Amino acid sequence: LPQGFSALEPLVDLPIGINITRFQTLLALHRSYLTPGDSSSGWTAGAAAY
Amino acid sequence: SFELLHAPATVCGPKKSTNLVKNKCVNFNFNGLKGTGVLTESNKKFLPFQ
Ligand SMILES: *[C@@H]1O[C@H](CO)[C@@H](O)[C@H](O)[C@H]1NC(C)=O
């Protein structure tokens, strides 16, 4: 995280009204000829972090 | 059929607009806040979400 300052402006507002306790992030993988394998091992991810 | 649920409402459709006057002491209700004053043009520019 760089040592800087920046403000966050609002994006959306959802009138949902449910109970939230947990969450999970998704991901997009890639499957090509350079990563042979089945649906459980033949994929590539890419460089990312959060 | 009408449903009542423990959630904020989404359909009310008030409508009932009114024209505009300037430089005259009039009562105004722009979005839900009341007041009693005069209107004119301002030079300051709001941020897009203000
Ligand atoms: C879920 O949220 C509601 C708020 O309407 C609350 O009354 C309730 O105790 C919460 N937990 C549940 C339903 O387990």
Side-chain angles (χ1 to χ4, degrees):
Chain A
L1 283 185
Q3 312 187 345
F5 190 65
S6 180
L8 296 174
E9 67 272 15
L11 213 65
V12 304
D13 207 347
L14 265 57
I16 301 299
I18 63 167
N19 295 27
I20 193 66
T21 312
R22 296 168 326 166
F23 90 104
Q24 184 178 2
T25 187
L26 289 185
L27 203 43
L29 302 171
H30 287 346
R31 298 184 175 170
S32 73
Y33 67 97
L34 277 175
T35 53
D38 59 317
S39 305
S40 184
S41 58
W43 53 267
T44 191
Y50 56 94
Chain B
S1 178
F2 285 129
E3 282 186 350
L4 160 69
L5 194 61
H6 190 231
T10 55
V11 293
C12 298
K15 299 156 74 173
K16 311 180 307 294
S17 176
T18 305
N19 217 326
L20 188 149
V21 286
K22 275 179 201 163
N23 310 80
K24 301 175 62 61
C25 192
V26 298
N27 274 322
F28 63 72
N29 188 339
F30 289 165
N31 190 359
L33 61 85
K34 333 283 190 53
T36 311
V38 72
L39 274 59
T40 181
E41 281 255 10
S42 45
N43 56 357
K44 57 210 189 57
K45 40 184 73 64
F46 283 9
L47 289 203
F49 64 100
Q50 316 262 17

